[PDB]
Design a protein around this ligand. Sequence first.
Ligand SMILES: N[C@H](C(=O)O)c1ccc(C(=O)O)c(C(=O)O)c1
Ligand SMILES: [Cl-]
Length: 435
Amino acid sequence: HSIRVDGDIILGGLFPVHAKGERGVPCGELKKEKGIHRLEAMLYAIDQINKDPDLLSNITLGVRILDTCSRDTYALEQSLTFVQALIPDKISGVIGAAASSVSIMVANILRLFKIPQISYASTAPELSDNTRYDFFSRVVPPDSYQAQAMVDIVTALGWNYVSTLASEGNYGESGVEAFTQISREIGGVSIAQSQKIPREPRPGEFEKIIKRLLETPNARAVIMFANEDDIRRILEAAKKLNQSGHFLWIGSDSWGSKIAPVYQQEEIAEGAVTILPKRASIDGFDRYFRSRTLANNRRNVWFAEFWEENFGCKLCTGLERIARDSSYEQEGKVQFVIDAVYSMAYALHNMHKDLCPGYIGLCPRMSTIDGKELLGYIRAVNFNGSAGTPVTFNENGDAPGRYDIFQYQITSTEYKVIGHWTNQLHLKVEDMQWA
Ligand SMILES: N[C@H](C(=O)O)c1ccc(C(=O)O)c(C(=O)O)c1
Ligand SMILES: [Cl-]
């Protein structure tokens, strides 16, 4: 009940195609953008490597994409499919997953069987530790650099007294913890209160959060690592308690430039500073995804379920066009998905150069690929990918801290590029606006 493509070297995939089900059920509603767009971006990238004669000459890359269902427990059970070769598909490297807690549980099982793992979205500072998850790499920067950026933004505005808000899980708690560590040890940034939002919150919890935050009234700036559904509800609760203009929101990559938490809540979201990793839209994937029909894209097992959710269809004509019959935007992490697959491909190409010299196709010396060796190749990889931007890794397996800084402004509503963070803060304070 998943995507299989035969090939010489088979690469594993982990994507949240469905959201986590309510109470009992494992899998719920289909994630159209966070699931299908990223899944199809891996299939686009793999097809491009097979098309390219220079990268892996007469060597084809295989696909084994599995659904994580937004939860770590389901992804762990799916992860065992990669290791079922040892008492049949042999998996060299796994691309995924999205969520940090999901990627942590996968990293713990893949390290023992010596399988390298490259993520496209997981940003938790815990994953950069080479003791706990030594086979983990990522094409997205760790939250150590985002928390440093947040400290830099706060200090540049003269905001010595702040409060923090976290969502339950690894991404929310450790992201705030990374901010706390930079604040406590270095400089003079004081934390008033660190409030936590539960995973399954009660109907009256978000109103209690605002009331608790108001107990330290001078702490106006709120640094937050909350999910899309959480931010929506905090700002909804803040608007209800007549707290317009009081709170100065600071959001992470989970907030980014999403219109979802700010919609019909434009007044309360005014002047909110957000940080997001440096990113561009790919027209190549856009041309690929728009030309996807139910006839040609039969290899995607979830594409039939996608067609119903996208147009309001029910299996309806079954001859619709994307970006013509329904509103279409390319997902953010798509650049990082393509750059993750190419990072794996370039490392395999570099391993082929060393182990099979003057050879076309796989040599008998590469019949069983060593994961401990291949991991070192991934870290050493340096190339221009997708956007034309360089893709690189350090010793710990992290991408460099390259960020965009946005502010939500009313003039017309937009996320205006007020600055950027690349090792050091470059922030244009002149372009900022408040209520
Ligand atoms: N950086 C966190 C993390 O570490 O999980 C993260 C991961 C994945 C997603 C996503 O699936 O889109 C988001 C998000 O909602 O922006 C945030
Ligand atoms: Cl995930």
